[PDB]
Design a binder for this molecule. Structure first.
Ligand SMILES: Nc1ncnc2c1ncn2[C@@H]1O[C@H](CO)[C@@H](NC(=O)[C@@H](N)CO)[C@H]1O
Ligand SMILES: Nc1ncnc2c1ncn2[C@@H]1O[C@H](CO)[C@@H](NC(=O)[C@@H](N)CO)[C@H]1O
Lengths: 147, 141
């Protein structure tokens, strides 16, 4: 998994066109959204993550939470951004992992938001430009899952 | 080299704290900038690129130009974005390669801009959200 963390004044998004034949079923209101003072987690789920969705998600939750703790962010936004990596995981796995990360951050007590999966999407962001407002993290499985 | 290409309605930046002991000296007017209807090239120069700066730069110019034509972008912005890679080239080489890419794109007729090198920088961007508005490329010797 590849994650780009941008501590921003805000994030706005707008669904523009489906990118998959059968994207995530969303309501009209889910097509657009905005969150203030937010640590945006742009995430690309990679092929190697398919080995252990649970472990990778756990590590991602841990890494993202740590950064939020360092920059004092109370709001976190999970944003699908497939082209952060060149070796993408299958859609079904990507969606599952993104959901796991989203739920995990919620469990940690953060106010969490997320954009719909499977779409070409426009977005506006405003990076704060502080030393830790722009970071990258690579997270991968250490062991295959047992299920 | 790791390149993240975002076709945007605009890109704005503001130089803040230095991120290197001795960054690129700049004037007050250079601390801020904006470009519209632009293909933003977020670039991270990698350690392996140090082997052949000219080759990597040439290839980067070719690929970025290709995308610009595909999306019909007349404006291109070279944006230092170190985080895209773990194996970074040393500052002096990284800046030289970014300038080489800048010059190559400028040579081709594009309206090109670039941000100061060696700083933490605030920025505002608006991704168009078209199918080709977000792309990544890996270019190495
Ligand atoms: N491995 C992966 N990691 C993250 N997202 C992935 C994915 N595979 C498929 N997607 C989803 O399908 C859209 C088109 O690739 C993706 N859309 C996007 O990444 C938008 N930013 C495009 O504007 C995303 O919703
Ligand atoms: N290998 C490399 N590739 C691209 N840029 C590099 C670099 N090595 C050093 N820099 C410059 O120094 C700042 C801190 O790494 C970098 N700053 C940035 O990447 C800002 N976006 C941080 O907000 C950049 O100006």
């Amino acid at each position: 998994m590849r994650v780009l963390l941008i501590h921003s004044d805000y994030i706005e998004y707008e669904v523009k066109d489906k990118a998959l034949k059968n994207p995530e079923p969303i309501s009209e209101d889910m097509k657009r959204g905005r969150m203030e003072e937010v640590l945006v987690a742009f995430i690309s789920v990679e092929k190697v993550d398919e080995k252990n969705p649970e472990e990778v998600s756990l590590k991602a939750i841990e890494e993202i939470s740590k950064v939020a703790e360092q920059v004092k962010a109370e709001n976190v936004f999970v944003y699908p951004f497939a082209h952060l990596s060149s070796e993408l995981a299958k859609p079904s796995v990507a969606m599952d992992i993104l959901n796991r990360v989203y739920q995990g951050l919620k469990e940690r007590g953060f106010n969490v938001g997320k954009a719909p999966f499977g779409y070409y999407m426009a977005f506006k962001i405003s990076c704060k430009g502080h030393p830790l407002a722009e970071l990258s993290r690579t997270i991968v499985p250490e062991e295959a899952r047992v299920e």
